Design a binder for this molecule. Structure first.
Ligand SMILES: NC(=O)C1=CN([C@@H]2O[C@H](COP(=O)(O)OP(=O)(O)OC[C@H]3O[C@@H](n4cnc5c(N)ncnc54)[C@H](OP(=O)(O)O)[C@@H]3O)[C@@H](O)[C@H]2O)C=CC1
Ligand SMILES: CCc1nc(N)nc(N)c1C#CCc1cc(OC)cc(-c2ccc3c(c2)OCO3)c1
Length: 224
C-alpha cells in the first residue's frame, strides 16, 4: 500500500494554512482532492485518509468524517496505535505505528489501495521521511491578486532533497476514473520551474504536480 502525501501550497514559500484554516477557498481544488482520495482502481477497495488532531477540528462538522474514505485522526493523547471509535473514524497515537498497522496485509486484507496523508503541517514534516509520493497543488496568485497571510508552511527543502518532479506520470498515477481538464504544461514562476496540469479559479492559477522519491544507492540490505 503506497503512502502518498496530498497537499495544496502557495508558491514560492509553500504556505498551506492560516489560523487553523485554509488561506483560500477553491471549488476546483476541493473537487480534485475529493476525487483523488475517494476514487480507486480496485472498485472493492477504499483509500485511507490520515490527519493530525488540529486538521480534523477545522473540517466542517457536516462533512466529517470524509465520506467513502477510512478516516484516521492521530493525537498523542489517544490510547492505541489504531482504534475504532465511531463508524469510519479511527483514533491513533502514533503516525509511524499507524502506518505499520495498516500496511500489514493481515489487518487490511488487501482492501486498502492507498494511504493518503491529508496532513496538517506537523504531520506533513513527519511525512517527508514516510511518504513515497507527493501530490502537490502548486498555487500562484495572478498579477492583480493579493497574497493571503499564512502561518503554516510545507518544508520545500526536505521535499526537494528526497523527491523529484515526476509530474510527467501524473495521469498514470491518478485513479483511471478521474476527469482532468488541461494538459501537461511547463511554466517558470519567480525563478522555479512549475510543471503539471494547469487550472484557474478566482484570482489563482494552480498546477497539480507529482513528486516521487529519488533513487537510492544500495548501501545495505538486511541479511539474516
Ligand atoms: N492546504 C492544505 O493542503 C492543508 C492545510 N492544512 C493547514 O494546516 C494547519 C494546521 O497545522 P498543524 O497544527 O500542523 O495541523 P496538524 O493537524 O498536523 O496538527 C498536529 C497535531 O497532530 C497530532 N500529532 C502530530 N504528530 C503526531 C504523531 N507522531 N503521533 C500522534 N499524533 C500526532 C498532535 O495532536 P495532540 O496535540 O492532540 O497530540 C498535534 O497537535 C491549518 O492552518 C490548516 O489550514 C491542513 C491540511 C491541508
Ligand atoms: C481541498 C483542500 C486540500 N487540498 C489538497 N491538495 N490536499 C489536501 N489534503 C487538502 C485537504 C484537506 C483537509 C481539510 C481541511 C480543512 O480545514 C483546513 C477543511 C476541509 C474541508 C472539508 C470539507 C468541506 C470543506 C472543507 O468545505 C466544505 O466541505 C478539509
Amino acid at each position: 500500500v503506497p503512502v502518498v502525501g496530498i497537499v495544496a501550497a502557495l508558491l514560492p514559500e509553500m504556505g498551506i494554512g492560516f489560523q487553523g484554516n485554509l488561506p483560500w477557498r477553491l471549488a476546483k481544488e476541493m473537487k480534485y482532492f475529493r476525487e483523488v482520495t475517494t476514487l480507486t482502481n480496485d472498485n472493492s477497495k477504499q483509500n485511507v485518509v490520515i490527519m493530525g488532531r488540529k486538521t480534523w477540528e477545522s473540517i466542517p462538522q457536516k462533512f466529517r468524517p470524509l465520506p467513502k474514505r477510512i478516516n484516521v485522526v492521530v493525537s498523542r493523547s489517544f490510547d492505541g496505535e489504531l482504534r475504532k471509535v465511531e463508524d469510519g473514524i479511527y483514533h491513533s497515537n502514533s503516525l509511524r505505528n499507524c502506518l505499520t498497522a495498516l500496511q500489514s496485509s493481515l489487518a487490511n486484507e488487501n482492501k486498502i489501495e492507498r494511504i493518503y496523508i491529508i496532513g496538517g503541517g506537523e504531520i506533513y514534516r513527519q511525512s517527508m521521511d514516510l511518504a513515497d509520493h507527493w501530490l502537490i497543488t502548486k498555487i500562484m496568485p495572478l498579477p492583480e491578486t493579493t497574497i493571503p497571510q499564512m502561518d503554516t508552511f510545507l518544508q520545500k527543502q526536505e521535499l526537494e532533497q528526497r523527491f523529484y518532479d515526476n509530474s510527467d506520470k501524473l495521469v498514470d498515477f491518478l485513479p483511471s476514473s478521474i476527469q482532468l481538464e488541461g494538459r501537461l504544461t511547463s511554466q517558470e514562476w519567480n525563478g522555479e520551474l512549475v510543471k503539471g496540469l494547469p487550472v484557474q479559479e478566482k484570482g489563482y492559477q494552480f498546477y497539480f504536480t507529482l513528486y516521487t522519491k529519488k533513487l537510492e544507492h544500495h548501501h545495505h540490505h538486511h541479511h539474516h
